[PDB]
């Protein structure tokens, strides 16, 4: 049983880990995007790209709050 | 102007904020829910309740990516 227990964990490792992994990459880029766009100034459009992007965060943010509550439904 | 772009970029920071916290309180939560499921093995359903957390976190993954593709889409 111990070998199949390590197995389950093993599993549920993987998947947690890659959970982690593609929110890692969504912060990474998402804080890359803000900060280069206000270092960026000379834009022509800085105004509309800064509402762009952050209702573009708003929008993710939402989402991911709705797959969250998803998340909690399948697992309760 | 100074005053007006210190304004955007509040608004930019607020927006990034609030995605990266909610990925944070995503991250923690899902930690302990797998953490505390394997400490909790006296469970008699630990096989299913070990495979429905794991396909939820690859489902939520993988809704977190398209959520993440649409933000790149949306500010091409």
Same mark, same amino acid.
């Given at each position: 049983?111990?070998?199949?227990?390590?197995?389950?964990?093993?599993? %549920?490792?993987?998947? %947690?880990?890659?959970?982690?992994?593609?929110?890692?990459?969504?912060?990474?880029?998402?804080?890359?995007?803000?900060?280069?766009?206000?270092?960026?100034?000379?834009?022509?459009?800085?105004?509309?790209?800064?509402?762009?992007?952050?209702?573009?965060?708003?929008?993710?943010?939402?989402?991911?709050?709705?797959?969250?509550? &998803?998340?909690?439904? &399948?697992?309760?």
């Amino acid at each position: 049983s111990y070998d199949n227990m390590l197995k389950m964990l093993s599993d %549920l490792n993987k998947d %947690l880990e890659k959970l982690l992994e593609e929110m890692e990459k969504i912060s990474v880029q998402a804080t890359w995007m803000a900060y280069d766009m206000v270092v960026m100034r000379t834009n022509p459009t800085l105004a509309e790209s800064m509402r762009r992007l952050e209702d573009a965060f708003l929008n993710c943010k939402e989402e991911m709050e709705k797959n969250w509550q &998803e998340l909690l439904t &399948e697992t309760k």
